[PDB]
């Protein structure tokens, strides 16, 4: 009956059915098929409306939400095409401290993370990646590793 969050959609360019998850913002052609804790990595791109417009990459972050989303979308494309792997781009480009650990945050339970991140993380299956996930930190690509 489709895992939590999944809905059927219709491609605008091709007319082929696909599947969208309204929690994780994941999108796929393929038909998709709870734990105390999950382990995730992420790639955060902050923007000017981030709760803390600063990171290890740059002292003042001045890009807009729209520009941050553009970046996130491009990283997702590269990951999905296999041109770049998630861990490489998190290391180079994540506005999170966890960039130094290939975007790895370790394991966590419900009640620790900002709610959209958490909900997304818990709706992913092991191995799966999110689409853009919006929190007060910025915009995330989330990969569930455990």
Ligand X SMILES: N=C(N)NCCC[C@H](NC(=O)[C@@H]1CCC/C1=C\[C@H](COP(=O)(O)O)NC(=O)[C@@H](N)Cc1ccccc1)C(N)=O
Is 45 strand, coil or helix?
strand
Chain centre distance of CA 60: 23
- Cβ proximity to ligand X, 58 vs 97, nearer residue: 97
- Cβ proximity to ligand X, 130 vs 137, nearer residue: 137
113 binds ligand X (CB under 6 A): yes
Count of residues making up the chain: 146
**φ, ψ for residue 124 (rounded to 5)?**
-75, 145
Of the candidates 28, 73, 114, 145, which one interacts with ligand X according to CB under 6 A? 114
19 binds ligand X (CB under 6 A): no
28 binds ligand X (CB under 6 A): no
42 catalytic? Reply is: yes
What is the edge-to-edge ordering of all strands in the sheet holding 17-21? 6-10, 17-21, 27-28
144 forms beta bridges with 40
Of the candidates 31, 52, 80, 125, which one interacts with ligand X according to CB under 6 A? 52
Q: Among all residues, which ones are annotated catalytic?
A: 42, 96, 114, 137, 140
């Amino acid at each position: 009956k489709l895992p939590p969050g999944w809905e059927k959609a219709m491609s605008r360019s091709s007319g082929r059915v696909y599947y969208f998850n309204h929690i994780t913002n994941a999108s796929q052609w393929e038909r998709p098929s709870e734990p105390a804790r999950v382990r995730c990595s992420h790639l955060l791109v902050k923007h000017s409306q981030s709760r803390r417009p600063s990171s290890w990459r740059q002292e003042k972050i001045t890009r807009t939400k729209e520009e941050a989303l553009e970046l996130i979308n491009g990283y997702i494309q590269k990951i999905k095409s296999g041109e770049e792997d998630f861990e490489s781009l998190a290391s180079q480009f994540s506005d999170c401290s966890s960039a130094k650990a290939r975007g790895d945050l370790g394991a966590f339970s419900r009640g620790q993370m900002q709610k959209p991140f958490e909900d997304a993380s818990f709706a992913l299956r092991t191995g799966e990646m999110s689409g853009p996930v919006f929190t007060d930190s910025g915009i995330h690509i989330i990969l569930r590793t455990e």
